Structure 1
């Protein structure tokens, strides 16, 4: 009933696909090469997300056990613990952040079913991935843009799932850095440099921030409140941008690619009475994002965890 897991590869090879300084104009040939190079990793991310979604849907212990079996197998293989292979950028380092976010969120959703021996194989594997991801940010030259926030999500989730306070603190640090980047106009300077994809990259930066706030909520802490609800300024900047890109068009000088808001709207619409602001975006779901933890529609309604 539980299909055999695919083999875990120690190395990641991934390829950058922007042609311009502002990381906004895509080279189709490099994009497809990146897709083909990362297809095993994205298939595994999608599979553990879906199987962990099915556990939350009906409580089926088979779904949880299959998720834990796939996680255990990649742990045993030292998956993603080898070389981060560079072709034209650090796209491999980014894949290890996104993959940690998927696998650590999948593990958190099924953790309540995990026996002491599954915990002993999976916990140390997630913890080394988290430290590898933190170590990347030790170089002051790498600017702490949306990648930093996507990085914090996986480190925080590992922290929570494996009871590692050092990883929780480093996760919180990343959240707080992102909240403090939010300007009075609700913009993020490092995302404003991204041209026709500026609006896209505000949506992309907000998502891991929302999901770190949801993880805090599991421990009974309200991080939405930080800096008198500063996160609301970014949520407004994004949701109004999806309705009308004019403000972004004026501040970037580039015509924006039209944005449909990602599934952070599913959690956000429930944290305050929204007076209809997220009605249109909600109607575009359900939202499946393995790197945010899978079925955000399901998790916003029923909880990231069952207990």
Structure 2
């Protein structure tokens, strides 16, 4: 690819994106404050519950509107996207339960679900020019994050785990083989493809994929403005602040994942700008929305900046590592986001 980390190697395929053993221990012995307590997943008998089935044949995400970008809604849209969002929610929940309890039963449930999708060759047949391309990057990563926490679990069908891992590896290699257009080549989608390749590169011990993934993080650092804003996200009008925050989600996971492999991505800078510059801009723009006026004149949609929104999951990981202050008071209720490993409060928050 040609970047400072084009020779990086996958050191340990079972390292995951957090220290599972150590975190489980803290959750089982330590004294959890009210916030952490509220984040504990509720146990359930997953062995007798069926999960979403994969679409058969070609993967097609219907258009949201019968025609154009607005107006009459397409009734086929809701049922199809829900199928994927349920798949992602269940995958992340089982991953989080396995971390918190350590019970092999949750790993068995996850594998049974994923084996169903692998056998059907899901997330592989689609038009790369359609919405399906984006749906794949989110769903493959979500399942990969959950599975990465149980790569060292001995009490599970090992042949089944191998089949699933090969499947995810195929899914990621195919999805990232497409370049994307003038924006999707290099905006937050590039970073989502980045976290997908990184976590799957690690569990499938595929150094080439792992390297390609780290390369998206590098690409992003060079697309940061003097004030910490992302070049491509500041072109989204009333959604500019939303996308600035959104891009922080996958970039944070690539860095957290790389860190468990002995690589310090967070320390990587380009022209006096790094990921911290981006974090500081998000916090400053939420306090003073006038800063966005240099890029867009429209009033900003701030739906993502409410306590409890999954969009804030990246703050739990970064705060746990760097210890900066919660300036905006966002970290009150627990946060859960399937696409960035489930509950960051459960997996990283340390009172």
For normalisation by structure 1, the TM-score amounts to 0.86
In 2, Cα distance between equivalents of 1:95 and 1:282: 28
The CA deviation at 1:212 is: 0.6
Q: 2:331 — aligned with what? A: 282
In 2, Cα distance between equivalents of 1:28 and 1:95: 23
Contact 1:153 1:211 in 2 (8 A): yes
CA RMSD of aligned residues (A): 2.5
Larger radius of gyration: 2
In 1, Cα distance between equivalents of 2:164 and 2:98: 18
- Classify 1:292/1:32 alpha carbon distance in 2 versus 1 (closer, same or farther; 3 Å): farther
Q: Equivalences for 1:114-133 in 2 at 5 Å? A: 114-133=156-175
Of the candidates 1, 13, 33, which is equivalent to residue 60 of structure 2? Answer: 13
1:271 paired to 2:321: yes
Q: 2:340 — aligned with what? A: 292
Q: 1:256 — aligned with what? A: 300
- Classify 1:32/1:107 alpha carbon distance in 2 versus 1 (closer, same or farther; 3 Å): farther
1:173 paired to 2:223: no
1:36 paired to 2:82: no
Question: Paired residues, what number?
Answer: 291
Q: 1:237 — aligned with what? A: 281
- Classify 1:230/1:52 alpha carbon distance in 2 versus 1 (closer, same or farther; 3 Å): same
Contact 1:13 1:38 in 2 (8 A): no
The CA deviation at 1:170 is: 0.8
The CA deviation at 1:139 is: 6.5
- Classify 1:249/1:12 alpha carbon distance in 2 versus 1 (closer, same or farther; 3 Å): farther
Q: 2:30 — aligned with what? A: none
Of the candidates 239, 259, 264, which is equivalent to residue 197 of structure 1? Answer: 239
1:4 paired to 2:44: no
In 2, Cα distance between equivalents of 1:291 and 1:275: 25
In 2, Cα distance between equivalents of 1:191 and 1:70: 35
1:107 match: secondary structure? helix
Gaps of 5+ in 1: 303-307
1:62 match: secondary structure? helix
- Classify 1:17/1:46 alpha carbon distance in 2 versus 1 (closer, same or farther; 3 Å): same
Contact 2:184 2:190 in 1 (8 A): no
2:324 match: secondary structure? coil
Gaps of 5+ in 2: 1-44, 306-310
In 1, Cα distance between equivalents of 2:71 and 2:148: 36
The CA deviation at 1:57 is: 1.3
